Ligand binder design. Sequence first.
Ligand SMILES: NC(=[NH2+])c1ccc2[nH]c(-c3cccc(-c4ccccc4)c3[O-])cc2c1
Ligand SMILES: [Ca+2]
Ligand SMILES: [Cl-]
Length: 223
Amino acid sequence: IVGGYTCGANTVPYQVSLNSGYHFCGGSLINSQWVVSAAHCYKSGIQVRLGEDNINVVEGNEQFISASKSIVHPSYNSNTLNNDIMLIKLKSAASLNSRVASISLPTSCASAGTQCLISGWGNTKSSGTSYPDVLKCLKAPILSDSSCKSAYPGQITSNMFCAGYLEGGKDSCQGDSGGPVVCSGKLQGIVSWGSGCAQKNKPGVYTKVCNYVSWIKQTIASN
Ligand SMILES: NC(=[NH2+])c1ccc2[nH]c(-c3cccc(-c4ccccc4)c3[O-])cc2c1
Ligand SMILES: [Ca+2]
Ligand SMILES: [Cl-]
């Protein structure tokens, strides 16, 4: 997260770190046995780490659970990143409490102007790499479709939305992919891509979760 602030330990209880010997992507807990992340964060050997703040120090509250299976959306396109969503089923259910809690899926999509909270352990520099130990937060608004399409002509599908600041300075970045974009207590987006990080007129692009709720529900119900 570039231009964000330190969240404060366990203030984002649905945030998870996907780990394979190092942190490579974020994710969101939506119930005690399932996590939602981005399809491009897929790999084998994923250990989901819940209740984290400093990802390099065991401080207490952490729950490390292995993924039993990861379900990449069948229509995921790695060249356009259209349908960049994945569901991860945990080997055992997590113990939910005040430090580990799930986030609700939306019933409707959000409107431009909605203020959301994006979090993650990704890079905090736009020009260079500086990875933090603790979780960073950023409050950012969803942009209108015209501004998004005007910024990325020909690359935005109906399953994506832009959120951020056109002046530059604040954005999600590498290491944040797969993580949550929460607005009014509902998970509206998943960190997907962007051109650089925090550059002027190049806002971040997120997977529009409201378009996948029936898919998530049906897939979980059958797995
Ligand atoms: N400007 C943004 N808002 C933004 C958001 C998420 C991002 N993720 C990345 C990213 C960069 C390099 C590699 C990966 C990557 C690739 C495979 C698996 C996991 C992460 C990224 O997610 C850049 C990147 C940029
Ligand atoms: Ca830790
Ligand atoms: Cl267009």
